[PDB]
Amino acid sequence: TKAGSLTIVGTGIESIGQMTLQALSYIEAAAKVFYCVIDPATEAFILTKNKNCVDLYQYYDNGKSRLNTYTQMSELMVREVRKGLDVVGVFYGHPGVFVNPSHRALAIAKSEGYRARMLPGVSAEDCLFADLCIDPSNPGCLTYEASDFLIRDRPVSIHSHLVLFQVGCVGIADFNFTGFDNNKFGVLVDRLEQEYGAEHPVVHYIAAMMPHQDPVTDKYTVAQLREPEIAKRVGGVSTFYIPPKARKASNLDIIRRLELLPAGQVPDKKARIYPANQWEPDVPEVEPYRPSDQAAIAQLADHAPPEQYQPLATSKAMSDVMTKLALDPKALADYKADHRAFAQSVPDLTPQERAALELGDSWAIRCAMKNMPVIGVIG
Amino acid sequence: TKAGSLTIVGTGIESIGQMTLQALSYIEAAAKVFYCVIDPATEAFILTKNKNCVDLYQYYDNGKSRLNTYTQMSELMVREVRKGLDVVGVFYGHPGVFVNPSHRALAIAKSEGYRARMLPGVSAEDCLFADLCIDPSNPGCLTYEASDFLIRDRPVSIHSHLVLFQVGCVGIADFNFTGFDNNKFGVLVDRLEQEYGAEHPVVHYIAAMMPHQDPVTDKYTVAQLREPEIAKRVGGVSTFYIPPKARKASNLDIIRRLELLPARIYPANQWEPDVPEVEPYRPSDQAAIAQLADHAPPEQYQPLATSKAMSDVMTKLALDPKALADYKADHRAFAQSVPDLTPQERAALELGDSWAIRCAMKNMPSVGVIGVIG
Ligand SMILES: C[S@@+](CC[C@H](N)C(=O)[O-])C[C@H]1O[C@@H](n2cnc3c(N)ncnc32)[C@H](O)[C@@H]1O
Ligand SMILES: C[S@@+](CC[C@H](N)C(=O)[O-])C[C@H]1O[C@@H](n2cnc3c(N)ncnc32)[C@H](O)[C@@H]1O
Ligand SMILES: [Mg+2]
Numbered sequence: 052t053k054a055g056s057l058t059i060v061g062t063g064i065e066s067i068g069q070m071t072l073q074a075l076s077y078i079e080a081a082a083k084v085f086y087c088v089i090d091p092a093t094e095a096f097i098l099t100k101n102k103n104c105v106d107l108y109q110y111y112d113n114g115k116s117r118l119n120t121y122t123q124m125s126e127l128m129v130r131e132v133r134k135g136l137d138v139v140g141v142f143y144g145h146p147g148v149f150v151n152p153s154h155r156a157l158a159i160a161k162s163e164g165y166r167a168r169m170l171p172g173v174s175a176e177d178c179l180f181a182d183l184c185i186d187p188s189n190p191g192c193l194t195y196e197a198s199d200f201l202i203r204d205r206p207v208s209i210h211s212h213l214v215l216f217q218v219g220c221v222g223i224a225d226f227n228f229t230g231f232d233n234n235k236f237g238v239l240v241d242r243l244e245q246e247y248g249a250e251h252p253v254v255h256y257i258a259a260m261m262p263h264q265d266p267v268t269d270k271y272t273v274a275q276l277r278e279p280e281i282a283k284r285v286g287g288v289s290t291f292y293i294p295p296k297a298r299k300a301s302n303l304d305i306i307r308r309l310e311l312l313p314a315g316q317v318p319d320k321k322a323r324i325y326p327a328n329q330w331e332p333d334v335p336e337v338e339p340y341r342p343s344d345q346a347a348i349a350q351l352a353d354h355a356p357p358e359q360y361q362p363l364a365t366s367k368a369m370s371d372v373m374t375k376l377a378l379d380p381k382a383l384a385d386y387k388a389d390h391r392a393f394a395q396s397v398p399d400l401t402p403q404e405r406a407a408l409e410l411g412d413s414w415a416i417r418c419a420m421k422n423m424p425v426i427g428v429i430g
Numbered sequence: 431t432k433a434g435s436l437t438i439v440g441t442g443i444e445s446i447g448q449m450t451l452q453a454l455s456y457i458e459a460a461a462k463v464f465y466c467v468i469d470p471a472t473e474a475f476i477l478t479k480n481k482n483c484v485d486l487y488q489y490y491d492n493g494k495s496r497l498n499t500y501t502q503m504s505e506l507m508v509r510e511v512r513k514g515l516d517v518v519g520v521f522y523g524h525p526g527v528f529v530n531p532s533h534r535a536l537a538i539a540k541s542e543g544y545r546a547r548m549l550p551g552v553s554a555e556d557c558l559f560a561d562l563c564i565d566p567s568n569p570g571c572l573t574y575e576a577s578d579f580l581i582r583d584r585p586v587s588i589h590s591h592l593v594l595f596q597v598g599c600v601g602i603a604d605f606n607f608t609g610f611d612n613n614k615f616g617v618l619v620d621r622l623e624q625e626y627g628a629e630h631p632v633v634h635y636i637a638a639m640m641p642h643q644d645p646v647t648d649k650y651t652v653a654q655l656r657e658p659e660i661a662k663r664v665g666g667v668s669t670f671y672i673p674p675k676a677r678k679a680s681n682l683d684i685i686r687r688l689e690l691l692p693a694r695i696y697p698a699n700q701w702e703p704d705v706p707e708v709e710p711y712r713p714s715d716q717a718a719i720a721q722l723a724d725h726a727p728p729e730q731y732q733p734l735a736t737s738k739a740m741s742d743v744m745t746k747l748a749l750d751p752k753a754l755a756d757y758k759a760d761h762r763a764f765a766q767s768v769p770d771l772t773p774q775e776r777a778a779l780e781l782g783d784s785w786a787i788r789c790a791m792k793n794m795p796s797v798g799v800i801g802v803i804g
């Protein structure tokens with residue numbers, strides 16, 4: 052085994068609360084930490100959990116290309132990996148969603164034979180779905196970088212959700228500590244008018260960064276984005292959400308191939324899943340209590356568990372070790388190095404529990420933890 | 431005006447580790463918990479954190495429409511809200527990403543006048559970006575439900591990433607405890623052949639659910655998906671990633687209006703067909719690295735300058751839901767009861783404005799919110 056590793060983790064968007072349990076445990080275990088976050092409470096919190104940190108944010112500067120900064124950020128991390136150290140990089144949100152230097156550093160580490168992994172986090176788009184009360188499933192979601200959207204003439208879909216990141220720095224390749232002069236913003240507004248029309252809604256979204264703050268969820272017309280006092284509200288942490296303009300027709304040939312309806316029958320056009328998208332222009336709210344809904348609610352009074360339902364029935368020893376593998380990176384490493392020896396080290400496991408842990412297979416652990424007489428489709 | 435609330439939270443995809451600190455703290459503080467997760471170690475963990483939990487998974491059944499189950503799930507949660515209680519619903523991953531009952535329950539609670547909020551979590555798409563080593567920024571990302579993709583003829587874009595959820599149950603409305611007979615999967619494969627070609631890559635992705643497991647990241651051709659032994663590997667936790675065919679050329683009219691020049695970023699997408707190796711250390715990269723020797727902190731860079739007392743209270747507001755509720759009820763009273771704050775710190779907390787808290791915690795030299803790493 053070659054010494055040295057790079058694990059890159061996120062902190063989420065809202066200070067501290069949106070960090071994952073595994074991001075925290077890897078930060079605490081690291082030999083060195085490199086971080087890039089944009090609120091002071093999160094920075095202070097990281098500095099309590101590890102005493103060998105470097106702030107990557109100081110490698111930005113007024114008038115400096117962001118590409119130069121990114122090469123510097125990545126080289127600082129890989130230099131320490133090359134000394135045989137367990138290094139952790141930290142980026143706000145999800146560390147691989149609209150983040151350049153993380154992909155670069157991990158690809159270099161991997162090419163040179165070091166252990167390299169990214170742990171996912173909660174992005175600004177994850178926050179958007181939660182705060183605007185939409186699901187990417189209905190009716191699909193397109194996500195772009197705003198400048199790229201324009202330069203490569205990326206296609207819109209007026210029947211699906213559209214999300215645009217980096218709307219506060221259209222055509223801007225450098226940095227300033229105070230803020231951007233977003234004077235090419237009109238080029239974006241022109242594209243939106245062309246595709247959606249002057250009166251279609253655009254939602255200006257800023258997720259709350261502090262736990263007591265409310266999110267910004269302000270609706271404007273495409274035309275209203277040319278007013279100055281409205282335009283200056285769009286900054287470095289602004290994202291746009293553009294809702295669908297219309298509903299796309301169903302394909303009858305596909306409906307028959309999928310056997311969803313027989314030949315001769317057409318879908319119910321006036322049918323929608325509750326609730327309606329609140330941001331769409333002139334769309335009425337759907338009824339939550341149709342007769343079929345009301346009948347399902349009646350069945351609750353009766354209801355008991357089905358015969359094939361598998362209730363949880365585990366032990367303290369088993370639950371404890373499974374929790375430990377998720378929260379203690381050193382215990383995980385030991386388990387992976389030798390399943391059998393780790394399994395024999397754990398007190399109080401039953402023969403079936405010890406064997407299931409010895410194997411490590413998903414089927415085995417489920418048999419050991421559930422009363423028997425992988426399907427999670429909630430979509 | 432009215433007692434009772436609903437907060438919906440997620441657990442992430444990989445057992446326990448991918449839960450957020452705030453999802454955990456709201457689960458602990460709740461009067462009643464309702465959960466729907468799909469591995470036993472996460473279920474066991476939830477049950478150690480609150481004494482009053484109900485498993486929503488028992489409302490599925492063989493040959494029963496998933497729609498009927500979703501209506502029952504939402505009504506059970508809102509019933510406890512109507513009793514004036516603080517209720518938490520828990521769904522695996524992000525609780526609003528391809529999840530029907532969460533949106534339903536939140537919309538009903540809001541319309542009736544109760545407090546209602548969703549806290550975001552780590553989705554299967556978040557895991558996909560991390561494990562396949564791709565960024566939705568480059569070159570854009572389209573995300574669809576596989577059956578909806580077919581039924582409403584949703585457009586493909588051959589120059590952007592494509593992600594498809596629910597590929598294991600094409601055209602299937604009901605539930606079965608054993609698994610799906612995914613016998614309409616061929617209709618999906620036909621659309622992908624029409625749009626991308628028989629030899630184009632499709633990556634079959636399953637994120638690790640247990641902390642010791644490896645992800646499934648198996649690359650097939652579209653044509654290979656017709657083979658019975660390959661098709662039957664696609665199940666209830668399977669997602670597809672389809673990479674771009676090629677790179678789209680820049681538009682000169684727009685380049686002129688943005689005032690740019692009339693150069694691929696490292697690293698290249700490993701999944702895209704016939705993409706060459708990009709050099710990590712070009713001349714410009716080598717010169718950026720040389721500058722690290724003499725580098726010092728910029729003049730307008732604002733180093734953190736805070737106190738133990740101020741850091742502690744900001745951490746407390748993020749990790750203690752009842753402390754947050756107390757502060758939001760009365761900023762003055764809360765700030766007065768925090769020991770050892772400076773006058774500037776106490777006044778900043780009383781205001782609660784972002785500008786005030788940032789001034790209190792940083793040195794401002796001779797005010798920005800600017801995090802563009804994309
Ligand atoms: C360099 S990127 C980093 C994104 C981050 N890694 C994430 O996971 O969301 C910066 C862009 O993220 C989005 N963003 C960051 N903070 C946000 C917030 N609080 N609310 C809404 N969008 C935000 C904006 O579009 C911004 O221009
Ligand atoms: C009902 S949805 C729930 C999604 C969940 N809320 C999330 O945040 O990802 C079920 C679909 O999620 C995706 N999914 C769930 N678990 C997964 C895993 N471990 N790896 C890849 N995709 C997964 C699959 O597309 C699956 O058919
Ligand atoms: Mg990534």
Ligand SMILES: [Mg+2]
Binds near residue numbers: 180184526
């Ligand atoms: Mg949502």
